[PDB]
Every structure is written in structure tokens, then in C-alpha cells.
């Protein structure tokens, strides 16, 4: 193996490595280390540990916050050159190096073996942060979460006397490292050590051919793409439309629903974007698939005056997945400053919550065509899992996501103000945040938001860690204390040892 690359501030590459998906956070370490093998990750961590240096890891660069790129980080280990994806016959599982990106993973697994696993739809997202935090996407209703396929993980860890090792932790019942496995099923990136690779396999796979080791997705899908012109919207129409979407999703979010195969995402962009958009997809092989999609669209439009433009077509799965995917290049990906938020639902928003959203999404005093809240269908196979079995919170029927993206740092204050205000107004009855209760079930650690730990925005009394992990947090602390007892791996929202 070629020796690990070290990139110092005098090297031309440093300024590029300092930048990832969020341009608000530019890293300035003493150096970037790019390793090629697990033994080089060991060496990198042990150097940092010996001299007390603050170390973080980057896989895909998609962190919503400054977890990797904090100005007090001294060393950044970038895993983008460990991206192998292959079947491992000794284990009967697909091996995925942590710097592989989801888009590449889907292509390799599918073309070479005809299988897939249910991760997210954004292309440049790294396996490192995605899987460990409880990755989901469009196939989750049918197949569950990424972590439901996590057979094993290999992790570089640091014990109380500064000794660095590489351990493989599996889900087998007698695995002495089982706890470290469980922590990676929703505990989140940057907490327990450097994940070097994951192994993926269905827990009920038959034999050991790769073609049976993970699920075959359905072969093709009816896809609907719908938009409603903002120029034609009223408050009442907005309220009614989102209510219909929500009501239909809450009736159809269990594995018993004959519509469980229908996945849909409603993007409510701010008015400056020109439209509200939705994409929906259903496997062709579901009984009456095409009629099911028609009933769904007709229900959506009941009692709503604006008529949508609609295109319907049929595509193979992988193409359906790339249609909906977010690009890793182009003006939407590169040089973009961002803020994201998250809130999960097991119940409908109220008419008052939706009128408040409408007030923020129609504001004519703001202009940002990439400002949006999104409602994302969820549930299904996700919620048939015993929730003790993984570290991811379960029970939401629907996720919601808030985002503003812009390019000018001059404008930071007004974009941050806009996203904070809409999210707080929506959650004004619960101290401005989704406190776990009858309607909210929390938030998703892979859409982190540090305003949850800010007394000016979170006036609920409920700490951030409850919001993101609910009842799994204290077990995560204990596993943290066992495996990273010096708190070498940390960030604003890292598991505190206890």
C-alpha cells in the first residue's frame, strides 16, 4: 500500500480539503491525513492521541454542522480514499469502506449483484456518517433502515491508557463486542472511534451467494412528479393540501396498509421558488399499483382549488432512485452555505401550525428559492422492529426537514433568522422544538441543529440528547465510557461519557 498522504496548509490541496458540503464551516487543521488502509488509520489516531491532539474524521463531508470542521480541530482524517465496495465471502456480507458514497454503493451493489439496501437519496453522502446515525430513504417503508442490515462494523478505538486498536463488532448474539455494534446502529458519527468499514447483510439471508445476501428491490416503479404553482395558492389551499397529505400518510404508514409501497415526499418551498413539489413512487408489481397512485393523487387534491401539473411515468428502480437523488456537483452542491433542521411526527400538524408555516413560506419580504420544509413519508417496515434492538429511535410515521441554502455570507443573518423563526413558530406550543409527545417523536441526529442546545431557541426544558436519541441516550453514554473512556472523539453533540 502507498503511504498515507499528509496535507499541510502550504500544499495546494489543503484549501480544497478544508471545504465540504457546507461552506459556512471551513476547517483549519494542522493537517489533513488521507489513509489507504486500516493500519494507516491506526497510525493517524495513535499520533494524535500521543500528543493530545483533537482529531475528527470525515467521510463524505455532509455534516449539517461544524462537527468535523471546528476551528479547534487539529487533525482531520479524511477517508475519501477508502471507498472499496465488494462482497466478503468469509462473512457472507457486503463490505463497505467508510469513504464510499451512497450513490456509488447503490450502483455497484445493484449492477453487479442485483441487490440493494435502504439508504438515503443524496449522492455524495459518505457511509461513515450516514449508516451509524440510522440512515433512511425511499425504500425504508418496505425494507427498513440501513442499520437493520448492519452485520458488522470495524472501528478504530482508544482505551484509557492511550492504546489504539482495531476491533470488529458484530450483531451475533454471543459477540463480546456486541455493545459497540449496537452503538453504531443509530448512535451517530464521531462518537466511538473511526469506522473503517461496515458489513451489510439481511439478518434472514439464505445461503451465501451475494445475490441473496441483501434484498432485491422491486424491478420498476410508477413515478409521479407533481407541482402546484405558488402563483395560484392561497392560505386555505396550502393548509388543506398539506392536511390531506398528512392525513393520508397517517392512515397508510403500517405494513398492513395496501398502500405501504407508496413512498411520497412533499417539498414546500418558500414562495420565491415558484412551486410546491411532490414526488411519489410505487412498485409496479403491487396489486393495482397504477390505480393506487391515482387514488392517492385524487385524495391529495380534495377541497383544494389549485390544480397541479403532473407527469407520470414508469422507470427501473435504480433510475427512479437517481431521478429523485440530489446531485453532488453543479450550483446546488458546490460552494453552498446551509442550515438544516428536523422534526419527526406520529400525528398531524394543526391548522394553526400550518397557517404559521404558510405565513413564513409566503413572506414576500424574503427571497430564497432554496428555502423549504419537506414532509417525508416513513414508517412501514421501520416500525416493525423491536426498538431495543437498535440505537435508532423508532415510531415516527413521518419525518420533516427544514433547509435554507445560499451563497453569500453577507446574507447569513437573514437566512438563519428565517429558518429559526419558521421552526420555532411551528413548535411554539412546545418551547420551539419537537419535544417527544403525542405528536412529535423528536429529531434525527443526521440532520443536527445546535439551536436545540440554545436557551434562546429551545425554551422547552428538554435537552438535545432526548430529542435525538430519546431513551437510548443513557445506554449510549455507558457504551461511550467503555470504549472511548478518554473522550478522544467528540463534538458539540457527541455522546457525553457517563
Ligand X SMILES: *Cc1cc2c(nc3c(=O)[nH]c(=O)nc-3n2C[C@H](O)[C@H](O)[C@H](O)COP(=O)(O)OP(=O)(O)OC[C@H]2O[C@@H](n3cnc4c(N)ncnc43)[C@H](O)[C@@H]2O)c(*)c1C
219 counts as binding its own copies under rule CB under 8 A: yes
* Of the candidate residues 39, 323, 385, 416, the single one contacting its own copies (CB under 8 A): 323
Q: Which one of ligand X, ligand 67L, its own copies, none interacts with residue 329, CB within 5 to 8 A by kind?
A: its own copies
Residue 101: DSSP 8-state:
B
Report in angstroms how near the CB of residue 459 gets to ligand X at its nearest: 27
* Of the candidate residues 17, 75, 122, 273, the single one contacting ligand 67L (CB under 6 A): 122
Q: Are 214 and 148 in contact (CB under 8 A)?
A: no
Ligand-binding annotation for 402, yes or no, is: no
Beta bridge partners, 312, equal 224
Residue 332 burial (C-beta neighbours within 10 Å; 0-12, 13-18, 19+)? exposed
* C-alpha cell recorded at residue 25: 464551516
95 counts as binding ligand X under rule CB under 6 A: no
* CA 445/CA 147 separation, integer angstroms: 14
Applying CB under 8 A, the span of 55-63, 111-119, 371-379, 481-489 interacting with its own copies comes to 111-119
Residue 149: active-site member: no
326 counts as binding ligand 67L under rule CB under 6 A: yes
335 counts as binding its own copies under rule CB under 8 A: yes
* CA 421/CA 433 separation, integer angstroms: 11
325 counts as binding its own copies under rule CB under 8 A: yes
* 84: nearest Cα among 103, 104, 100: 100
* C-alpha cell recorded at residue 176: 463480546
Applying CB under 6 A, the span of 115-123, 229-237, 264-272, 293-301 interacting with ligand X comes to 115-123
* CA 81/CA 490 separation, integer angstroms: 23
Query: Based on CB atoms, which residue is closest to ligand X, 292 or 490?
Result: 490
H helix runs in 98-192, sequence order: 102-113, 127-132, 140-143, 178-183
Catalytic residue among 238, 366, 375, 469: 375
Residue 447: active-site member: yes
Applying CB under 8 A, the span of 293-301, 314-322, 371-379, 425-433 interacting with its own copies comes to 314-322
C-alpha distances out from residue 243 to 135, 239, 293, 402, Å: 27, 6, 18, 18
312 counts as binding its own copies under rule CB under 8 A: no
338 counts as binding ligand 67L under rule CB under 6 A: yes
Q: Give backbone dihedrals phi and psi of 50, rounded to 5 degrees, phi first.
A: -55, -45
Q: Are 492 and 477 in contact (CB under 8 A)?
A: no
Catalytic residue among 263, 447, 468, 473: 447
For 202-271, the DSSP string reads -TT--SS-HHHHSPPPPSEEEEEEEEEEGGG--HHHHHHHHHHHHHHHHHS-STT-TTTT-EEEEEEE-G
Residue 39, C-beta contacts closer than 8 angstroms, at least 6 positions apart: none
442 counts as binding ligand X under rule CB under 6 A: no
C-alpha distances out from residue 454 to 431, 477, 492, Å: 12, 22, 12
Query: Based on CB atoms, which residue is closest to ligand 67L, 297 or 324?
Result: 324
Cell numbers 446546488 correspond to: 332
133 counts as binding ligand X under rule CB under 6 A: yes
149 counts as binding ligand X under rule CB under 6 A: no
* CA 484/CA 172 separation, integer angstroms: 22
Beta bridge partners, 404, equal 339, 371
Binding track over 306-335 against ligand X, x by CB under 6 A:
--------------------x---------
Ligand-binding annotation for 59, yes or no, is: yes
Length of the chain: 498
Binding track over 29-68 against ligand X, x by CB under 6 A:
---------------------------xxxxxxxxx--xx
* Of the candidate residues 21, 97, 148, 484, the single one contacting ligand 67L (CB under 6 A): 21
* 201: nearest Cα among 87, 122, 313, 296: 87
252 counts as binding ligand X under rule CB under 6 A: no
Ligand-binding annotation for 195, yes or no, is: yes
**Total interface residues for ligand 67L by CB under 6 A:** 11
Q: Are 155 and 194 in contact (CB under 8 A)?
A: yes
Using CB under 6 A as the criterion, which residues of the chain lie in contact with ligand 67L when the complex forms? 21, 62, 64, 120, 122, 326, 338, 340, 401, 403, 447
Using CB under 6 A as the criterion, which residues of the chain lie in contact with ligand X when the complex forms? 21, 56-64, 67-68, 79, 98, 120-122, 125-126, 128-130, 133, 135-137, 189-190, 194-195, 326, 446, 491
**Active site positions, annotated:** 375, 447
Using CB under 8 A as the criterion, which residues of the chain lie in contact with its own copies when the complex forms? 2, 5, 11-13, 15-17, 19, 34, 78, 80-81, 87, 103, 107-108, 110-112, 114, 123, 216, 219-220, 225, 311, 313, 315-319, 322-323, 325-331, 333-335, 407
Binding residue numbers:
57, 59-63, 121-122, 126, 129-130, 136, 195, 444, 446
Binding residue numbers for FAD:
57, 59-63, 121-122, 126, 129-130, 136, 195, 444, 446
Amino acid at each position: 500500500t502507498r503511504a498515507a498522504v499528509t496535507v499541510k496548509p502550504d500544499d495546494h490541496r489543503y484549501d480544497l480539503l478544508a471545504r465540504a458540503d457546507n461552506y459556512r464551516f471551513v476547517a483549519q487543521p494542522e493537517y489533513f491525513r488521507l489513509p489507504y488502509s486500516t493500519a494507516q488509520v491506526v497510525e493517524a489516531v495513535s499520533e494524535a492521541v500521543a500528543a493530545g491532539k483533537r482529531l475528527t474524521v470525515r467521510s463524505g463531508g455532509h455534516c449539517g454542522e461544524a462537527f468535523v470542521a471546528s476551528p479547534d480541530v487539529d487533525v482531520i482524517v479524511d477517508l475519501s480514499s477508502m471507498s472499496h465496495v465488494g462482497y466478503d465471502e468469509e462473512r457472507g456480507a457486503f463490505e463497505v469502506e467508510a469513504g464510499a458514497t451512497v450513490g456509488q454503493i447503490y450502483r455497484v451493489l445493484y449492477k453487479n449483484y442485483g441487490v440493494t439496501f435502504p439508504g438515503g437519496f443524496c449522492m455524495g453522502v459518505g457511509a461513515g456518517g450516514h449508516i451509524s446515525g440510522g440512515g433512511y430513504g425511499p425504500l425504508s417503508r418496505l425494507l427498513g433502515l440501513t442499520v437493520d442490515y448492519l452485520h458488522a462494523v470495524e472501528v478504530v478505538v482508544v482505551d484509557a491508557e492511550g492504546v489504539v486498536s482495531t476491533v470488529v463488532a458484530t450483531r451475533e448474539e454471543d459477540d463480546p463486542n456486541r455493545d459497540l455494534w449496537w452503538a453504531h446502529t443509530g448512535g451517530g458519527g464521531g462518537n466511538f472511534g473511526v469506522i473503517t468499514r461496515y458489513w451489510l447483510r439481511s439478518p434472514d439471508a439464505v445461503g451465501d451467494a451475494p445475490e441473496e445476501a441483501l434484498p432485491r428491490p422491486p424491478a420498476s416503479f410508477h413515478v409521479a412528479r407533481v407541482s402546484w404553482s405558488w402563483a395560484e395558492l392561497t392560505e386555505a389551499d396550502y393548509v388543506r393540501l398539506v392536511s390531506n397529505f398528512l392525513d393520508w400518510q397517517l392512515r397508510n404508514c403500517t405494513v398492513d396498509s395496501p398502500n405501504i409501497g407508496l413512498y411520497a415526499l412533499l417539498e414546500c418551498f418558500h414562495r420565491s421558488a415558484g412551486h410546491l413539489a411532490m414526488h411519489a413512487q410505487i412498485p409496479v408489481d403491487v396489486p393495482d399499483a397504477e390505480e393506487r397512485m391515482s387514488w392517492f393523487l385524487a385524495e391529495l387534491n380534495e377541497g383544494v382549488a389549485v390544480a397541479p401539473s403532473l407527469t407520470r411515468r414508469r422507470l427501473p428502480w435504480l433510475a427512479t432512485s437517481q431521478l429523485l437523488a440530489i446531485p453532488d456537483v453543479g450550483p446546488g452542491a458546490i460552494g453552498v452555505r446551509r442550515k438544516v433542521k428536523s422534526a419527526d411526527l406520529r400525528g398531524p400538524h394543526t391548522r394553526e401550525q400550518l397557517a404559521a408555516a404558510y405565513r413564513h413560506l409566503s413572506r414576500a419580504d424574503y427571497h430564497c428559492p432554496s428555502a423549504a420544509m419537506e414532509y417525508i413519508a416513513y414508517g412501514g417496515r421501520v416500525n416493525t422492529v423491536d426498538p431495543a434492538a437498535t440505537a435508532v429511535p423508532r415510531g415516527a410515521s413521518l419525518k420533516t426537514f427544514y433547509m435554507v441554502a445560499w451563497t453569500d455570507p453577507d446574507e447569513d443573518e437573514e437566512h438563519l433568522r428565517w429558518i429559526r423563526e419558521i421552526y420555532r413558530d411551528i413548535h411554539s406550543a412546545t418551547g420551539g422544538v419537537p419535544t417527544p409527545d403525542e405528536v412529535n417523536t423528536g429529531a434525527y441526529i443526521n440532520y443536527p441543529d445546535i439551536d436545540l442546545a440554545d436557551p434562546e431557541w429551545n425554551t422547552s426544558g428538554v435537552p438535545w440528547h432526548t430529542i435525538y436519541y430519546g431513551d437510548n441516550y443513557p445506554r449510549l453514554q455507558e457504551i461511550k465510557s467503555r470504549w472511548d473512556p478518554r473522550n478522544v472523539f467528540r463534538h458539540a453533540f457527541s455522546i457525553r461519557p457517563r
